[PDB]
Design a protein around this ligand. Structure first.
Ligand code: HEM
Ligand code: HEM
Ligand code: HEM
Ligand SMILES: [K+]
Ligand SMILES: [K+]
Ligand SMILES: [K+]
Ligand code: NA
Ligand code: NA
Ligand code: NA
Ligand code: NA
Ligand code: NA
Ligand code: NA
Ligand code: NA
Ligand code: NA
Ligand code: NA
Lengths: 157, 157, 157, 157, 157, 157
C-alpha cells in the first residue's frame, strides 16, 4: 500500500471527529428550528454540511492511500440543552478537532505527505472560522443580553 | 345515499371545528392588526384561510356522500384579550380539533371509507403543523421575553 | 372609546348579515357544483368571496371604533333545494340586508360618522348589484324555460 | 417471492377490473364520436386513458412483488345502446370496482403491505371521482332534459 | 348498413389481433423494465402504443361501416420467460397478424372497399417494420452474443 | 410530552437504521469511485443522500413529539469487499429496514398517530424502490455477466 500507516491513522482520527460534528451540528440545527430560532438553525445546518464535505474528502484520500475508512466508530455527541450550552459544546468540539488536526499535520510533514497536509490545513482553516463564529456568538450574548441575542436569531436572513 | 351515516356525522363535526377556527383566527388576525402587530396579524390571517380551504374540502366530500353539510352550527369562540391568551386559545382549539380528527379517522377506517380517511389525515397534518407553530411561539415568549416577542411581530416579513 | 355605541351595534348587525351570506352562498355554490351546474357554482363562489371582503372591512372598522366584533352569532341560513329556490332565497337575504344597510346609514348620518356611512354605502351598492343579478336570473328562467336556463349554466365561462 | 400470495390475487383482480373499464370506456368513447357527441367522446377517452395508467401501475407492482400480471382474463363488457345506458353501465362498473378495491385494501392492511394499500387508495380516489362525474351526468339529464343534455355534448370544450 | 358484412368480420379479426398485441407487448415491456433492460422496455412500450393506435383506427372504421366492434374476445397471449423467447413470441404474433392482414386486403379489394384496404395496408407496413426489428434483434443476439446483447439494452437511448 | 413513548422508540429505531444506511452507502459509493466504477458510485451517493433526507424528517418529527432524537447509536456497517457483496449487503440492510418500518407503522396505527404513520409509509416506499433497484442489479449480473455489468458502470450517465 502506498500510504503511510500512521498518516492513515491520523486521517481516520480526523474523520472520526468530523462524524461527531456532522451529527452534533445537525441535531443542534433541528433543535434551534424546533424552538423557532431559525437563524441559528440555518447557520448550524450549514456547519453540518461543511463537515460532511470534509468527511467526504478524508474518505477519498484514505481510499487513495489504500487504507480503510472508519465510519463505524462514532464518539460522544455532547448535545446542549439551551443555546448557550449548545454554542459552548460546539466550541469545545472544535477546540478538540483543531488540536487533532495540528498533530496530524506535524506527522504528514515528517513523512513528506504534503498533499495530505494541504488537505488537513484546508479543514483546519474552516474549523478556525467556526471557532471565530462561536466565540463571537458567545461574546454577543454578553454584550446585547441573552434575550436580545435570541430575538435576533428568530428570523432567517 | 352512498355515504355511511356516522362518517357524515364525523365530517360535519370536523366541519364545525373548522368553522370555529375560521372565525376565531380571522378575528385574532384583525385584533393583532389593530394593535400594530402586523406580522402576527398576517400569520393568523393565513391560518384562517387554510381553515377555509379545509372547510371547502369537507363540504365537497359531504355532498358527494349525499349528506347535508352543516354550516349553521357555530360553536364557542374563545377570543383572547392579549397575545399570550390568543395564542393559548388557538392552541386549546387545535388540541380539541386533533382529538376529533383522530376519532373520525378511526371510524372511517372501520367502515372502509379510505378516501374520507385520507382527506382527514391531510387536515390532521395541517393542524399538527399549527400546533407546532403555536407551541413554538409560546416558547419564544419565554425565551426572548414578551416585550421582545411582540416587538419582533410589529413589522411584516 | 371613540365610536358611537349605536353605530357599533349597526355595524355588528350588518356583519351578522354578511356572516349568513358567506355561508349560505358558499354552500349554494358547492351544491351547484355537485349538480354539475358549474357556471352557477362559480358565480355564487364569487358572491361568497365578495361578502367575506365586506365582513373584513366591517371588522376592521368596528375595531378602529373600539367596539367588539361579533363573529359568534350566526343567524338562519335558508338553503334552497333546487336552483329556483336557491336564487329566491339569496334574493330574500339581500332584501333583508339592504334594509338593514339603509337603517344603518341613516343613523351614521345622524351622528356624523361619515366614514362609516361611506363604507356601508359601498356595501349597499354591491348588494344592489347582486339583487340585479338575482332578479335577472329568475326572469331568464321564465323567458327561456327552466331546462334551457340550467343547460346554459352547466359549463363554466 | 417477496409478495403475499393473496395480495397478488387482489392486485390481479383489480387489474382485471381496469382491463374491462379500458375497453368499455374506449368503445363508448368512439360510439359517442360516431354519433357526433364529441364532448362525451372526449371525456370518455380520457377516462379510458386514466384506467390504462392505473393498469400500468398495478402491473409494475405485481412484477416487483414477483407475481404474474394477468392481462389474459377479460371479463364482461356491458356496452350500452344509448347515452343513458352507457353512463349507467359505466356507473355500475365503477360500483363493482370500488367494492373490490375496498376488499383489497382490507387485506393489504392485514398483512402490512402498506405500499400496495397506498397504490390502491389512489386508484380508489380516482374511481370515486368518476362515480361523481357519472352521477352528475345522470342527474343533469333529469334536470335539463335528455335532448338538451345531448345538445350540450355535441361540440368539444 | 353500408358496410360489407365480411369486410366487418375481417376488420374485427384484425382488431382482435391488435388487442392481443397491445397486452402482450405491454407486459413484455414491463417485464424488461423489471429486469433492468430499459432500452428493450422502452422500445416494446412504443410498439404497444402503436398497436393501440391501430386498434383505434379499426374501431372507428367499423363504426362508420355500421358494424359492432368486438373488444370482448381476447385471444391467447404468449408471454415469454426470457428475452429470446419474448422476441420470438412477438415475431410469431406478427407472422400471424400479417397473414390475416393480407387475407383482409384481398377481400376488401374484391368488394371495392378501397378505403378499408388502404387502412389495412398502413397497418401491414407498420407490422412489417416490427418484423424487421424483431428479426434484427434475434440476429444481433447471434452476432454479438446474448450477454453483450442484453448489456446493450440495459440503458435507455 | 405530546408523543406516545413507544412511537418515539420506533421512530428512533428507524432513525438508527437510516444512520447505518447513510454511512454504509456513502462508503460503498466512494469505494466504487476509487475503483473507477463511477456510475455505481454516483447511484450509491444518491441513495446515501436520500437516507439523509429521511433521517432529517424523522429528527424533526421526534422533536415535535417532544422526544430526544438518537444520533449517537450507530449499528453495524457490513461493508462488502467487491461489487456483488456490496449490493447484497445493501439489500440485506434494506430487508431489515422494511421489517422495522412495518412494525413501527403497526404501532402508530394502534395509538392513532396517523401523521407519523404517513411519514413512515413514505420512507417505506422509498426503501422498497431501493430493494427493486438492488434485486435488479443482482439479476443483471447474472444475465449479462459480472465483467459486462461492471463495464456498464465505469462511465457516468
Ligand atoms: C364557510 C366558511 C368559509 C369558507 C368555506 C370560506 C372559503 C374561502 C375560500 C375557499 C377562499 C379562497 C382561499 C384561497 O384559495 O386562497 C376564501 C378567501 C377569503 N376568505 Fe373565506 N371562507 C369562509 C368564511 C370566511 C369568513 C367568515 C371570513 C371573514 C370574516 C372570510 C374571509 C376571507 C377573505 C378576506 C378571503 C380572501 C379574499 C380575497 O381573495 O381577497 N372567509 N374563503
Ligand atoms: C393492458 C391494457 C392497456 C394498457 C396498460 C395501456 C397503457 C397505455 C398508456 C400507459 C398510455 C399512455 C397514457 C399517457 O401517459 O397519457 C396509453 C395510451 C393510449 N392507449 Fe392504451 N393501454 C392499454 C390498452 C389500450 C387499448 C385496448 C386501446 C384501444 C382500443 C388503447 C388506446 C390507447 C390510445 C389511443 C393511447 C394514446 C396514444 C397516443 O399517444 O397517441 N389502449 N395506453
Ligand atoms: C445525521 C446524519 C446526516 C444527516 C441528517 C445529513 C443530512 C444531509 C442533508 C439534509 C443534506 C442535503 C441533501 C439535499 O437536500 O440534497 C446533506 C447533504 C450531504 N451530505 Fe449529509 N447528512 C448526514 C450525514 C452525512 C455523512 C456522515 C456524510 C459523509 C460521510 C454526508 C455527506 C453529505 C454530502 C457530501 C452532502 C452534499 C453536500 C453538498 O451540497 O455539496 N452526510 N446531508
Ligand atoms: K430588543
Ligand atoms: K336548448
Ligand atoms: K462488452
Ligand atoms: Na470573533
Ligand atoms: Na389602531
Ligand atoms: Na415547536
Ligand atoms: Na335585472
Ligand atoms: Na357517423
Ligand atoms: Na355529483
Ligand atoms: Na432486419
Ligand atoms: Na484509484
Ligand atoms: Na426489479
Amino acid at each position: 500500500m502506498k500510504g503511510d500507516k500512521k498518516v492513515i491513522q491520523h486521517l481516520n482520527k480526523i474523520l472520526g471527529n468530523e462524524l461527531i460534528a456532522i451529527n452534533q451540528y445537525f441535531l443542534h440545527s433541528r433543535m434551534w428550528n424546533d424552538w423557532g430560532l431559525k437563524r441559528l438553525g440555518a447557520h448550524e445546518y450549514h456547519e453540518s454540511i461543511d463537515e460532511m464535505k470534509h468527511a467526504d474528502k478524508l474518505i477519498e484520500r484514505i481510499l487513495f492511500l489504500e487504507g480503510l475508512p472508519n465510519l463505524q466508530d462514532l464518539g460522544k455527541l455532547l448535545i446542549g440543552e439551551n443555546t448557550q450550552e449548545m454554542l459552548q459544546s460546539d466550541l469545545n468540539l472544535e477546540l478538540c478537532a483543531t488540536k487533532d488536526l495540528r498533530e496530524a499535520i506535524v506527522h504528514c510533514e515528517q513523512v513528506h505527505d504534503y498533499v495530505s497536509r494541504d488537505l488537513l490545513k484546508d479543514i483546519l482553516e474552516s474549523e478556525e472560522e467556526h471557532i471565530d463564529y462561536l466565540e463571537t456568538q458567545l461574546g454577543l450574548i454578553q454584550k446585547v443580553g441573552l434575550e436580545n441575542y435570541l430575538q435576533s436569531h428568530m428570523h432567517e436572513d
